Every structure is written in structure tokens, then in C-alpha cells.
Design a protein around this ligand. Structure first.
Ligand SMILES: *Cc1c(COP(=O)(O)O)cnc(C)c1O
Ligand SMILES: *Cc1c(COP(=O)(O)O)cnc(C)c1O
Lengths: 442, 442
């Protein structure tokens, strides 16, 4: 007693929009540093019947029965998680149930400090995440500043973490948790010098490596697992998994932490795990451990290096003047345009990127930069030689943005009206669509 | 630069477990009242490439661009949502982003009351959900008792919501939110009477209709939308959608509540939405509003009535001596066995049900009942005539549990040793598998 008709039949209208979205994805140069494209296998798992099953609790300790094949899956996922990140059963545990990077952070932070607890994180405009305790002056924008009492540190004017300001603010504030690892940081992190600050004040060290997880896994960047009490990471983004998250916790450094994290996730916050998510994570953490994935991660970094260099060779400025990772923040002050306007121009040419603050920005409104990243295009098979074209496309986009701003004004509302119809944009778009359209697409 | 090989090939190990789980689901009489089986179309959406896309924010008001087709999906889903539950655009709003029923309740409650806010809900052992403010004498088990100040009401010894106890507790405690709608309540709810209690205290009325959502949509049970300020429902369970949740809010009764709910979800709690979830919710809500779905919901109620009746006809006691909905709680005291034990016996015979407390249980350990429901089996095509067999199977399961208990003792560990290699159970299991196995299976 159900309708078994395929999606095309059963809901034509939704099948059409979904087909368009796929075409868009396929025909776009995607530079969103936090996006990627999952393979077909991951998507078979996300659509598996395993999500019919309710599984509140943990393996061997479920509320309900019938959970034997489910337990093997969660078990496999924890196994594959701890090894991908080169840690041992006996030092580190992992929770694979958090539904999102934001959930994992909220849960992990609750487990460590509880309500009213004190936390330190990097400011949003400076490149920290919302769930790192973000607030405005007026109101607590993130639960992490309301459930918790949070203070925010900034980066210096060169766009580097001001470790000395981290110490100044910590000693005065005495947080129980200091969060590092960011949303928009083009340089690797000094986890050791964070480990020293926490130790100095008896704080937990929290590394959110969501943006760079693959570099940590692949031994290409610094290892927070030698210094952190807790590491969180999304499974999507550069890891190229489904939409989910992982909480790692150092048993050796804090016995009794395993209980605090496992019970914070459920029953404090979540209900039943989403087992399709867990299956898909398992499926990608296998891939993550294969040496072809290390190749891919290396290709990501090469492309990023090549992208930065090509942009510099076209006299475009980058925050910190380069990158150690997959992402580049462009400083646009030189051209008297906002990242705000450039996003609009690139949207108009099937190029995906987003506005981003730069150190000199006092507010988060009308920011002076854009963030770009190479994980998605690398997945699509672009190599170092392809970065010049992307850089070329971006420079042309910056130039057209300058031309349209002089013709239509600095007012963002007014700027947009210039975009539609523009022959330069249409030609550049078609250039993009023609190159993007035919690239490998999972 | 990715692996395109199918799941069977790319990860044989996971594929075999998943295949086993599909066979378990198929060969089980599944009476878990909160479970169902999604159709293929819902599962094409869960594995759609739409989940590649980051969509922080709401339609027309996203952080990033490239979001036109995503915006059309979220808008469709909210539209199909508001009509399914027969409410007008102009009186009711919905948020389709919450990832789980539990997140919806945490997010919805935070929007209404804020940290330290006062809430009232039904106790867990009485059938209220964890996210209704559950705590123990020792621990704040759910975030909803720690983040908020919560008080828990109970049902009377007949298993009915004790409205007089609700008013009492509400006047003494003055909450800002009173939650009703439950996890394990076999009867319909008097929302008008809750609405009156909330008015005398100026509290919000919160209806979590996750278990009975389809009865509300199809106009078979009472309509909470006539009285409630806020209604939450999972999209899974009886609604038979994917794993996700909805928050409905009454604009007409509460000005400026729309932004309170929309902002608590994001950016207070969640990050990007999971667009595959929103897609799938849209696809099922289309179904919900179709006349075939009302038929199904009617078959669910018919089946429950027949199962209740056939259980009574075999001298088995039911809490409230029947049901108005999809679920029955069996009282086992008459047989001197625990729900705990019966769950084990039914596990051993491919029958899924769960232990449940009854009013006379003061412990939530070693409870005296079991909860059963008809949504999953109705989906699989069982009709009223088939409930006899299921009642017959449960009666026989109770008897074997009786026999095994006095042969092995009343201690849980001792009891379980009797299950393996018991000829009666293997025979009964065989009968179950044979009947379940050939039933229609999405
Ligand atoms: C993207 C991100 C998150 C949140 O991930 P979601 O799954 O989108 O909630 C958390 N922390 C960091 C550093 C991130 O980059
Ligand atoms: C099952 C349930 C929930 C939570 O649903 P999840 O998706 O498992 O978080 C919330 N409220 C009620 C009444 C429920 O039955």
C-alpha cells in the first residue's frame, strides 16, 4: 500500500528542478572553498533503506533490538574514521552520529564545558565559524555565545592568527575551551603553540579541521591530533563525504571524556542516528584512506598554489600573500570594488565564489575580499595548467566589475542592474559553460 | 579525479551488510510504532546531487549565489507543507530546515523562551519525548532540561493525560511553553483544554504531532492547528517521509514569531540545510495531500483498531483499554513478565516492538509494557484480517516468554540464555519470516 512510481513519474515538477540543478552544477566553475562533489557510491548509501531503522543509543547498547546489521555499520565507520586520521583505538575515540559540523561543535562544546561555560574562538569576520561562539554587539547570533559565555579573538593586519593576542585574552578570561581551525584561513595552524596556551590556563584544546581535514589525514599539513583534546570535522567539504560530522576525543589525555561526548550527542541533543549518513561516511572514509585519495589531496594543494601564483602574476593581492592549503582570500581594495559586487559578477558568469572579510574590514557589511578554493574543480579533473584560465576568468571578472561600477555606481542595488544583457558577461559565461560543461562530473 | 565504481564494486564489505539489513527489514513483522518504509522516489531524492550545494540562509535571502533552483525546492516544500496540514499562507508559516524532530523541538523552544526559559512537558516514562524537558533526579538527561528550566507532568493511573494536574502545575510554576503531543500515547489529545490552560498563564501552546501527523493532515484526529502557537512534526514515522522535521508557527496569533523561529534554526543552531532532505520532504508531502494517502492513513487506524480488538479477544490488557490512533501499549502485569523480556522474545522471532512503561511503573527500568504500532505493516499491505495473525503471534510470544521465565528465572541475563536453540521460537520465527518475506516491500 504505497506509490512505487519513479521520481520522474511520481513528481515530474520536482524532477525538473533537480535536473536543472544538476545541469547548473555541471556547467559551473565552482570555487566555493567548502563545496565538493560526492561520488555515485556515497549517493547510493544516502538513498539506502538503512534509514528506515531507528537506532537510538550506541553499538551493543541500543534502546531497541533488530539493530545488528546497523551496529556493524556504525562500528565499521568508527574503525575507518580513526585510521583515516592515523590515530589508535586506545588513545582516541570517535562519535560518528553528529548530523552536521555545527551540531558536532555544539555537542562537543557542551560535553566539555556545559551551559554557562567559557569558550574562546576566532571572530567570524576574521574567519572563525558561527559555532565558535559568534555574537554581534546587540544579540547572541550563535547558540554558542548564548548557551556559553564566549570571547572572540582576531587575526592581525597581515591576516595571521595573533597568538600573542590569544594569550593576552586567555590569561585574562580563563576559558575552559579554546577553539582553533577555521572557515576562511589560507595558512596552516600552529597547534603546538595553542596547546601551550591552553596548558598555561588549564583549557581544553579544540581543533575544528572541517576545511582542511584531508590535509590532516594525508599528512600534508600540521597534525592537531598530537596536541588536541578534541578534534571535530565535517565529512563533506574537502573530505568529499556526505553531509555529516565527526567528533574525535583524546582518551589518554582525559579519561571519562568518552562518556561526556557520547551522551552530549545523544540523549542531550540528538535522537536516532541517521544511518544512511553513517553508511555514506563509512563509504568515503574507505576512499579517504586509499593512496589515490592522497593523490587527489595533493592535486588540490598544487592547484591552489598554481592558482595563487597566476593571480599574483596578474597583480591581484591575496591575504597573507599566498596559501598553505586549498583556499585563497583575495584582497580587492586595489580595485575599489567589494567582494560583495564580485560575487554578483561571478554569479552572472557561472563562477561560484563568495564574499569574505579582510583584516582591514571593520564591519562584516560590504567586505573587501572573496574566498576561493580548489577542492571541487580538482574533483572535476582540473590540473595546474587549468588554474591560469580560472585566474584569467577571475581577472576579467574583476575588470568588468570595475567597468560596471563606474557606469552604474557604488550602490549595490544600482550595480546589479548593469549585469543582465552585458555582452562581455554573456561571452565570458559561454566561455565558462563550454569549459565547465565538459569536465569530468561524478 | 574521483572513483566512479558502483557501491557493490567500490566497497563490497559495506554493500553486503546493507544487503543483509534490506533482507532483515523484509523478513520482519515490524511493529515499532515510530518506523516506516520510504518509497523509491523519496530515496532517489535523498541520494540526489542537490546535497552538493551550500544554502545557508533562506530563499531569496541566501548567503551565497547559485541558489535559484535550491530556492525553488525549499519554496515548493514549504508550500506543499502548509497545504498538507490544511493551513493558509497568511496565518501559518513553516520552517523545513530542521534535521530531526529533536532539533526542531530544541530550536522551536529556544526561539520561544530562550536560555533559562520555563517549559512544561510530559514525563518520559509517561510518554513524553526526551526534548520535552526530560531530566532525572541525578542528571539533566536532555538539553531541554539544562538549557531550559523544565517541569514534567504525568498521566493518571488509567493512562490518560491528567489535565487537572497540568493546570495545577502550570499555575504553581508559570511556564512560558506547555508541550503536548507524545511518543507513546494511545489516545487523541484535547488541545482545546491545553489552550485554555496556556491562556490562564500566558504560556505558549506547543503541539508535537510527530507520531500522529498523518491523522492530523488527513483530518482523522483532532486538529492542533486550531489551538497551537507552534506545531512540530517529524517527516518520517507515520508521515512516511525522510528523516527530517517541520516547525509550523501561527503568524496571526504571534507577530514577529516568524523571524524568531527562522533565526533559532539558522544561524543559532544549524549551518547549511541538507537540500537532499528538503527535496525528499517535498516529494512526500505531495503524496500526503493525495487521496491514496488518506486511504493509507485510514488503513493504519483500521489496522490498529483490529489489532487492539483481537488482542483484547485473547485476554491481553491494553493501557486505556484501546487506542484512537496507530499505537497500542500492552500491559503485561497479568503475566508476570516485563516488556523488557518480551522485546527479547520478539527479537528472537523477527518481530520488532519495544518495551514501554505503564502508569504503575515508577522505574523506567524493567518496564511492564510494550508499545506496538501499525504504520510499517500497513505500508507493507496488511489489512484488518491480518491483525489476527499478529495478535496470535504476540499471544504465543507472551506464552513462550512465560514458559522461559520460570524455566530460567526472572533475572534478565538468566532469561536471555533460554532464547537461542528454543524449538518453539525457531518454528514461530519461521512462520513470521514466511509471512513477512512475501509482503509488498518498497
Ligand atoms: C562548514 C563548517 C562548519 C559547519 O558545518 P555544517 O555541516 O555546514 O554545519 C563548522 N566549522 C567549520 C570550520 C566549518 O568550515
Ligand atoms: C520521534 C520523536 C521525536 C524526535 O524525532 P527524531 O527525528 O528521532 O529526532 C520528537 N518528538 C516526538 C513526539 C517523537 O515521537
Amino acid at each position: 500500500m504505497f506509490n512505487n512510481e519513479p521520481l520522474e513519474q511520481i513528481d515530474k515538477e520536482l524532477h525538473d528542478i533537480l535536473a536543472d540543478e544538476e545541469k547548473r552544477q555541471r556547467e559551473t566553475i565552482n570555487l566555493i572553498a567548502s563545496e565538493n562533489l560526492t561520488n555515485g557510491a556515497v549517493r547510493e548509501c544516502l538513498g539506502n533503506r538503512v534509514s528506515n531503522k531507528y537506532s537510538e543509543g550506541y553499538p551493543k547498547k541500543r534502546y531497541y533490538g533488530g539493530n545488528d546489521f546497523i551496529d556493524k555499520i556504525e562500528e565499521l565507520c568508527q574503525k575507518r574514521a580513526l585510521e583515516a586520521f592515523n590515530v589508535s583505538d586506545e588513545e582516541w575515540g570517535v562519535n560518528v552520529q553528529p548530523l552536521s559540523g555545527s551540531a558536532a561543535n555544539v555537542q562537543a562544546l557542551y560535553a566539555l564545558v556545559g551551559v554557562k561555560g567559557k569558550i574562546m574562538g576566532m571572530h567570524l569576520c576574521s574567519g572563525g565559524h558561527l559555532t565558535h561562539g559568534f555574537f554581534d554587539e546587540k544579540k547572541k547570533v550563535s547558540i554558542t555565545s548564548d548557551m556559553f559565555e564566549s570571547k572572540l579573538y582576531k587575526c592581525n593586519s597581515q591576516g595571521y592568527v595573533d597568538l600573542d593576542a590569544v594569550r593576552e585574552m586567555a590569561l585574562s578570561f580563563k576559558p575552559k575551551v579554546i577553539i582553533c581551525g577555521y572557515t576562511s584561513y589560507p595558512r596552516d595552524i600552529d597547534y603546538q603553540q595553542f596547546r601551550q596556551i591552553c596548558d598555561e590556563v588549564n583549557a581544553y584544546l579544540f581543533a575544528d579541521i572541517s576545511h582542511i581535514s584531508s590535509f590532516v589525514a594525508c599528512n600534508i599539513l600540521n597534525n592537531p591530533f598530537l596536541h588536541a583534546d578534541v578534534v571535530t570535522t565535517t565529512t563533506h567539504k574537502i573530505l568529499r563525504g556526505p553531509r555529516s560530522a565527526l567528533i574525535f576525543f583524546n582518551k589518554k589525555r582525559n579519561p571519562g571524556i568518552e562518556q561526556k561526548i557520547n551522551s552530549a550527542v545523544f540523549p542531550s541533543f540528538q535522537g536516532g542516528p541517521h544511518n544512511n549518513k553513517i553508511a555514506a561516511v563509512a563509504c568515503q572514509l574507505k576512499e579517504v584512506h586509499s593512496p589515490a585519495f592522497k593523490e587527489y589531496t595533493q592535486q588540490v594543494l598544487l592547484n591552489s598554489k598554481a592558482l595563487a601564483k597566476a593571480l599574483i602574476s596578474k597583480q591581484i593581492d591575496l591575504v597573507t600573500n599566498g596559501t598553505d592549503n586549498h583556499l585563497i582570500v583575495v584582497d580587492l581594495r586595489k580595485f575599489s570594488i567589494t567582494g560583495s559586487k564580485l560575487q554578483e559578477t561571478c554569479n552572472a558568469i557561472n563562477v561560484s565564489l563568495n564574499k569574505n572579510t579582510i583584516p582591514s574590514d571593520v564591519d562584516c557589511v560590504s567586505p573587501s575580499g572573496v574566498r576561493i578554493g580548489t577542492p571541487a574543480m580538482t574533483t572535476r579533473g582540473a590540473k595546474e595548467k587549468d588554474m591560469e584560465f580560472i585566474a584569467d576568468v577571475l581577472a576579467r571578472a574583476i575588470k568588468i566589475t570595475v567597468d560596471l561600477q563606474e557606469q552604474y555606481g557604488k550602490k549595490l542595488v544600482d550595480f546589479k542592474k548593469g549585469l543582465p544583457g552585458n555582452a562581455q558577461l554573456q561571452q565570458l559565461k559561454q566561455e565558462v559553460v563550454t569549459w565547465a560543461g565538459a569536465l569530468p562530473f561524478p
